[PDB]
């Protein structure tokens, strides 16, 4: 059996660990850099404001980040805000019977405005603590449904990705050389037909991830666009190609978390003709796209090959001793 | 027979529990999400009581992972494209039209120099420059900080992570957690260790620093999240380890641009159609969420490899020590 | 010749793989954090707008990102935009003979504005589909040359980089301790004279990368500022130093790609005195600087050393068999 185990370990190292595990290569992680450009426009027949356009280029993307990017899909717009005092929103913690309940400063922190000791009426029927803040306060209301920027589904993002492996002084780009420029003029990614088209539709991105753009885009979320560069360096540089994946990253489950979906506040400031400041507060919901790039590669190397082969010999010594037992 | 019992206790006992060398390694793919909550009041000198809603007014701008909380500032207003005197400086000062060179003397004092020489005041005179005017006065930042209420702010930090190799992923919000809990919990090493909502002050504090001394001139806080999991263990044992470091140097010497700050502006189309802007030198603390980690389950490839060398190693151990 | 191969593998492991490959160390990747601050100002004698200043601090850098940063170098400014209906731009797809060609909503998506069914004249000689949108449209024209913010070449960016190796509880900063503060007051990086000056001039950055700031800055691009921390931790902590590299990242070749160079749109919003909104649309071209920090380090360790030595012994066993076959 001594000649049998010896033929087993030789088929175990060369056959198993050197093609299946490919242990004869040195590893190297990817040094990445990405670039996005979103194209589209969206209409909205607001209740009172009437038809309105949002050019996803300028109006839709706060702000214009490096790798990742954020597409506005839904919103609650508070206007004509000015530095002033006013009534908090009706709430067990905010409600007051008189000047005694309102404490200056402390009752402030809670309702997004600083409380002055004064107690005022939120309306005729009810009364609550006065707060100085950006006024009028933001109404407490649910986001519109369907989403205003529902046209977002049909947007499209061009994703350029240059990568390099420092160790192997090798680099490549997600736009393969065998590609027409007129092709990228109107192509759009799809696993089936056009797999090399770096322009992805937003909906397709969310879809592919087993989700639904229209249900998401109401309260927001974050989509992970994973690009994987797993190349065999010893193979032709032509075989090196990006593998695109798509995940929803945040939790949809209302329980067992907080800040469901994804959203943030931002503002537009306007010097009124009176010289006084006013701002428009915007609670924007949307989908944030995180472009996550990673990978590994390796050519042949004598250092790792000899070191694995060496242990394969010592391992055949034990194996023949395991055959004796 | 004694050395053979030593190497067996050396590999299985030492390198396979202490070094845990029977596992395959994998680095983390991370993704984070922050939301800062708070508000702050300022009784400016002249401007009087004023509110800054850390949500909208306090965070320029709203970045991905990391985020930046405005804590102090020097506000220059009513800026317009125009000419005016540079700030008094050995390089900028002039005796007459001869000292002011057009364009060149520009680069230095944050405005372009027209050949003209003008008085910065009655007693002194310096090169005229076109620029955003009036210039930003040269003054120290307020102390205490205006947005000193910042200490008491709180940041929710969500962190989803995945290990590609082991097709495994977890989130910093553990499943054994009420939603009402996260409604008002606040992190603390002692009582609530699983509360992902950290107070800013606590963050700076924990790092052995002081929010009020920092927030005056600014700095950058590293919020390190470490995911070191044993994948062969139950997926339930996989948990984030939070650390806190100040990253920038507080020492005035041996560096430049102490603390952390930047300029930004607010533009306003005047009714005359002419442009004016408000220049703001914002100081603050920038929070860098740095996520990293490693994990590994059992694997025959690495185990046999290491055991193999352990045998060859007992050959040199017994042959070389017998020679000694 | 067996005593010969045994002296060969010994000189192969200790001599080759343990000094040249340094395989006796454990590896560790760098934890990084960077901070940039760009300083400069730039003038522009626009056609009609006359002399104008852009303080790279505030006016030049949309927006103020974490690691990477973006310097505005060229632009096409569309002003007095307001929500309104107006003619699309002349195009085979947009052109219309009458009300019949213009479909409400659908002909919208294409020309950056939503089409109302009505067909209007883009001018006296031609007519095209009316669209509601931010109006007037952005004229279709090529970016100015030379670039308006051509003064950008002479800007300078301070790049502060703190790094740490978690495993070895070791950390260091790209500003070495042997450095005066007055030095960094006016130093400027150069491979030759001042190699330890973390304040790089933009042009020098692009130059070093074998490119030209003035040709780039017209249509934009992205520069990779690579910082490499390759330290030997068993060596004195003083030998640990950053190596700076520079490499244009985007493709200049017009063919075999799209979105050549680098640019984006952004806007300035103004509440008109009438209460109505107006905005200034800006197609900004520029160079985006990506600070890419990476590295590896390692001290001595018995685990990896014994491992490699162990295989060197088994390797000497087969090496005896290699000279056997050579003997025939
Ligand atoms: C440029 O020219 C090619 C013309 O064939 C085109 O190739 C294909 O594109 C379609 C996309 O739906 C595939 O259905 C089709 O199989 C491909 N055709 C063949 C057989 O070549 C390329 O896509 C264009 N650019 C390149 C070079 O990829
Ligand atoms: C999850 O939910 C419950 C309900 O809020 C928490 O219960 C509180 O928990 C503690 C610890 O057992 C009690 O001492 C308190 O009396 C409870 N508070 C009140 C007033 O209801 C429970 O702690 C939470 N579990 C976790 C995630 O630790
Ligand atoms: C948008 O809103 C109005 C008011 O309901 C409607 O009359 C008009 O048709 C709508 N426009 C489009 C293009 O849908
Ligand atoms: C997106 O695409 C299709 C095809 O144009 C269109 O019919 C549908 O209305 C679009 N969805 C939205 C909500 O814009
Ligand atoms: C802030 O400043 C003024 C002026 O001294 C004072 O009258 C007012 O009470 C202060 N506001 C608060 C609520 O702290
Ligand atoms: C702003 O600009 C003009 C510049 O001449 C000056 O007259 C005016 O005083 C300034 N306005 C304010 C409110 O300070
Ligand atoms: C935040 O909290 C405590 C609450 O008692 C208070 O003492 C402190 O003044 C607050 N800090 C600041 C700086 O407002
Ligand atoms: C800029 O533009 C004008 C108009 O051509 C010229 O008169 C003026 O000298 C220029 N300014 C500078 C400082 O170069
Ligand atoms: C800007 O917008 C309006 C509305 O279309 C137009 O009537 C007006 O002429 C424009 N103003 C200027 C300054 O050209
Ligand atoms: C920048 O620097 C050089 C050297 O001072 C100067 O000759 C050149 O004019 C400058 N470039 C621009 C665009 O001002
Ligand atoms: C600091 O000081 C001395 C002053 O003579 C000078 O030689 C040296 O170059 C400076 N060191 C650095 C790091 O610039
Ligand atoms: C917004 O709010 C206040 C409410 O009293 C009103 O005085 C002001 O005119 C409004 N601003 C405009 C001009 O829309």
GROMACS .gro file of C-alpha atoms in nm, chain A residues 110-305:
model
  196
  110UNK     CA    1  -3.688   6.671   2.187
  111UNK     CA    2  -3.911   6.826   1.918
  112UNK     CA    3  -3.646   6.966   1.679
  113UNK     CA    4  -3.645   7.323   1.812
  114UNK     CA    5  -3.536   7.497   2.133
  115UNK     CA    6  -3.813   7.558   2.386
  116UNK     CA    7  -3.863   7.900   2.532
  117UNK     CA    8  -4.042   7.888   2.869
  118UNK     CA    9  -4.356   8.025   2.702
  119UNK     CA   10  -4.654   7.796   2.634
  120UNK     CA   11  -4.858   7.854   2.320
  121UNK     CA   12  -5.148   7.705   2.129
  122UNK     CA   13  -5.064   7.470   1.844
  123UNK     CA   14  -5.422   7.537   1.739
  124UNK     CA   15  -5.754   7.645   1.893
  125UNK     CA   16  -5.832   7.306   2.054
  126UNK     CA   17  -5.482   7.220   2.177
  127UNK     CA   18  -5.172   7.390   2.318
  128UNK     CA   19  -4.806   7.291   2.332
  129UNK     CA   20  -4.460   7.430   2.419
  130UNK     CA   21  -4.325   7.717   2.211
  131UNK     CA   22  -3.986   7.656   2.053
  132UNK     CA   23  -3.751   7.875   1.858
  133UNK     CA   24  -3.630   7.687   1.551
  134UNK     CA   25  -3.661   7.689   1.173
  135UNK     CA   26  -4.028   7.784   1.135
  136UNK     CA   27  -4.282   7.680   1.037
  137UNK     CA   28  -4.191   7.334   1.182
  138UNK     CA   29  -4.184   7.034   0.953
  139UNK     CA   30  -4.530   6.878   0.952
  140UNK     CA   31  -4.536   6.525   1.087
  141UNK     CA   32  -4.668   6.329   0.789
  142UNK     CA   33  -4.595   6.013   0.594
  143UNK     CA   34  -4.403   6.027   0.263
  144UNK     CA   35  -4.606   6.035  -0.061
  145UNK     CA   36  -4.706   5.712  -0.230
  146UNK     CA   37  -4.637   5.640  -0.504
  147UNK     CA   38  -4.300   5.824  -0.480
  148UNK     CA   39  -4.281   6.163  -0.653
  149UNK     CA   40  -3.958   6.078  -0.830
  150UNK     CA   41  -4.112   5.746  -0.934
  151UNK     CA   42  -3.967   5.808  -1.281
  152UNK     CA   43  -3.640   5.712  -1.111
  153UNK     CA   44  -3.688   5.347  -1.196
  154UNK     CA   45  -3.609   5.423  -1.559
  155UNK     CA   46  -3.288   5.615  -1.489
  156UNK     CA   47  -2.956   5.475  -1.586
  157UNK     CA   48  -2.612   5.490  -1.433
  158UNK     CA   49  -2.285   5.459  -1.620
  159UNK     CA   50  -2.028   5.293  -1.396
  160UNK     CA   51  -1.666   5.312  -1.499
  161UNK     CA   52  -1.418   5.103  -1.298
  162UNK     CA   53  -1.041   5.108  -1.337
  163UNK     CA   54  -0.853   4.854  -1.126
  164UNK     CA   55  -0.492   4.748  -1.065
  165UNK     CA   56  -0.290   4.479  -0.890
  166UNK     CA   57   0.016   4.650  -0.741
  167UNK     CA   58   0.217   4.329  -0.694
  168UNK     CA   59   0.179   4.208  -1.053
  169UNK     CA   60   0.205   4.557  -1.204
  170UNK     CA   61  -0.113   4.474  -1.393
  171UNK     CA   62  -0.428   4.675  -1.450
  172UNK     CA   63  -0.750   4.678  -1.651
  173UNK     CA   64  -1.086   4.855  -1.693
  174UNK     CA   65  -1.448   4.733  -1.689
  175UNK     CA   66  -1.484   4.862  -2.044
  176UNK     CA   67  -1.331   4.582  -2.248
  177UNK     CA   68  -1.120   4.678  -2.557
  178UNK     CA   69  -1.344   4.482  -2.792
  179UNK     CA   70  -1.618   4.745  -2.764
  180UNK     CA   71  -1.757   5.009  -3.006
  181UNK     CA   72  -1.813   5.361  -2.872
  182UNK     CA   73  -2.143   5.385  -3.056
  183UNK     CA   74  -2.228   5.066  -2.869
  184UNK     CA   75  -2.206   5.238  -2.532
  185UNK     CA   76  -2.409   5.521  -2.686
  186UNK     CA   77  -2.733   5.332  -2.624
  187UNK     CA   78  -2.656   4.989  -2.480
  188UNK     CA   79  -2.801   4.894  -2.141
  189UNK     CA   80  -2.684   4.608  -1.923
  190UNK     CA   81  -2.869   4.277  -1.909
  191UNK     CA   82  -2.727   3.942  -1.803
  192UNK     CA   83  -2.862   3.775  -2.117
  193UNK     CA   84  -2.815   3.998  -2.424
  194UNK     CA   85  -2.561   4.271  -2.328
  195UNK     CA   86  -2.336   4.149  -2.041
  196UNK     CA   87  -2.052   4.390  -2.123
  197UNK     CA   88  -2.263   4.705  -2.110
  198UNK     CA   89  -2.148   4.914  -1.809
  199UNK     CA   90  -2.458   5.133  -1.824
  200UNK     CA   91  -2.708   4.982  -1.579
  201UNK     CA   92  -3.072   5.084  -1.551
  202UNK     CA   93  -3.165   5.157  -1.192
  203UNK     CA   94  -3.477   4.939  -1.187
  204UNK     CA   95  -3.281   4.645  -1.331
  205UNK     CA   96  -3.028   4.693  -1.054
  206UNK     CA   97  -3.294   4.677  -0.783
  207UNK     CA   98  -3.482   4.405  -0.967
  208UNK     CA   99  -3.183   4.174  -1.013
  209UNK     CA  100  -3.138   4.202  -0.636
  210UNK     CA  101  -3.480   4.045  -0.585
  211UNK     CA  102  -3.646   4.369  -0.479
  212UNK     CA  103  -3.890   4.621  -0.613
  213UNK     CA  104  -3.791   4.974  -0.710
  214UNK     CA  105  -4.137   5.120  -0.654
  215UNK     CA  106  -4.187   4.978  -0.303
  216UNK     CA  107  -3.830   5.069  -0.204
  217UNK     CA  108  -3.823   5.420  -0.352
  218UNK     CA  109  -4.098   5.529  -0.119
  219UNK     CA  110  -3.904   5.506   0.210
  220UNK     CA  111  -3.558   5.459   0.062
  221UNK     CA  112  -3.285   5.199   0.096
  222UNK     CA  113  -2.926   5.118  -0.004
  223UNK     CA  114  -2.826   4.899  -0.295
  224UNK     CA  115  -2.489   4.725  -0.307
  225UNK     CA  116  -2.342   4.705  -0.655
  226UNK     CA  117  -2.065   4.451  -0.606
  227UNK     CA  118  -1.792   4.426  -0.867
  228UNK     CA  119  -1.566   4.120  -0.832
  229UNK     CA  120  -1.226   4.100  -1.007
  230UNK     CA  121  -1.106   3.741  -0.975
  231UNK     CA  122  -0.835   3.693  -1.233
  232UNK     CA  123  -0.581   3.422  -1.303
  233UNK     CA  124  -0.272   3.623  -1.387
  234UNK     CA  125  -0.086   3.334  -1.554
  235UNK     CA  126  -0.384   3.313  -1.794
  236UNK     CA  127  -0.412   3.564  -2.080
  237UNK     CA  128  -0.487   3.919  -1.964
  238UNK     CA  129  -0.792   3.886  -2.189
  239UNK     CA  130  -0.963   3.640  -1.951
  240UNK     CA  131  -0.967   3.902  -1.673
  241UNK     CA  132  -1.323   4.029  -1.637
  242UNK     CA  133  -1.556   4.190  -1.377
  243UNK     CA  134  -1.842   3.992  -1.218
  244UNK     CA  135  -2.141   4.212  -1.125
  245UNK     CA  136  -2.372   4.126  -0.833
  246UNK     CA  137  -2.658   4.312  -0.667
  247UNK     CA  138  -2.774   4.314  -0.305
  248UNK     CA  139  -3.009   4.523  -0.100
  249UNK     CA  140  -2.803   4.620   0.204
  250UNK     CA  141  -3.044   4.769   0.460
  251UNK     CA  142  -3.312   4.584   0.655
  252UNK     CA  143  -3.673   4.605   0.532
  253UNK     CA  144  -3.808   4.456   0.859
  254UNK     CA  145  -3.965   4.743   1.064
  255UNK     CA  146  -3.889   4.559   1.390
  256UNK     CA  147  -3.536   4.482   1.511
  257UNK     CA  148  -3.398   4.813   1.383
  258UNK     CA  149  -3.440   5.190   1.347
  259UNK     CA  150  -3.417   5.453   1.073
  260UNK     CA  151  -3.588   5.212   0.831
  261UNK     CA  152  -3.501   5.269   0.465
  262UNK     CA  153  -3.275   5.565   0.385
  263UNK     CA  154  -3.320   5.942   0.394
  264UNK     CA  155  -3.172   6.268   0.512
  265UNK     CA  156  -3.257   6.636   0.548
  266UNK     CA  157  -3.099   6.918   0.345
  267UNK     CA  158  -3.181   7.277   0.259
  268UNK     CA  159  -3.184   7.561   0.010
  269UNK     CA  160  -3.096   7.900   0.147
  270UNK     CA  161  -3.232   8.227   0.009
  271UNK     CA  162  -3.141   8.582   0.106
  272UNK     CA  163  -3.483   8.744   0.114
  273UNK     CA  164  -3.501   9.097  -0.033
  274UNK     CA  165  -3.553   9.222   0.323
  275UNK     CA  166  -3.203   9.095   0.398
  276UNK     CA  167  -3.349   8.828   0.627
  277UNK     CA  168  -3.271   8.457   0.571
  278UNK     CA  169  -3.520   8.191   0.467
  279UNK     CA  170  -3.465   7.826   0.380
  280UNK     CA  171  -3.649   7.534   0.225
  281UNK     CA  172  -3.620   7.215   0.428
  282UNK     CA  173  -3.632   6.890   0.238
  283UNK     CA  174  -3.664   6.545   0.390
  284UNK     CA  175  -3.541   6.344   0.095
  285UNK     CA  176  -3.593   5.973   0.074
  286UNK     CA  177  -3.405   5.777  -0.190
  287UNK     CA  178  -3.188   5.481  -0.278
  288UNK     CA  179  -2.818   5.512  -0.214
  289UNK     CA  180  -2.599   5.305  -0.445
  290UNK     CA  181  -2.277   5.170  -0.293
  291UNK     CA  182  -2.028   5.053  -0.553
  292UNK     CA  183  -1.829   4.789  -0.369
  293UNK     CA  184  -1.523   4.665  -0.558
  294UNK     CA  185  -1.300   4.378  -0.451
  295UNK     CA  186  -1.097   4.086  -0.581
  296UNK     CA  187  -0.786   3.871  -0.586
  297UNK     CA  188  -0.538   3.733  -0.840
  298UNK     CA  189  -0.216   3.534  -0.872
  299UNK     CA  190   0.045   3.403  -1.116
  300UNK     CA  191   0.278   3.104  -1.066
  301UNK     CA  192   0.554   3.116  -0.803
  302UNK     CA  193   0.824   2.871  -0.691
  303UNK     CA  194   0.817   2.986  -0.328
  304UNK     CA  195   0.457   2.867  -0.256
  305UNK     CA  196   0.478   2.563  -0.486
   0.00000   0.00000   0.00000
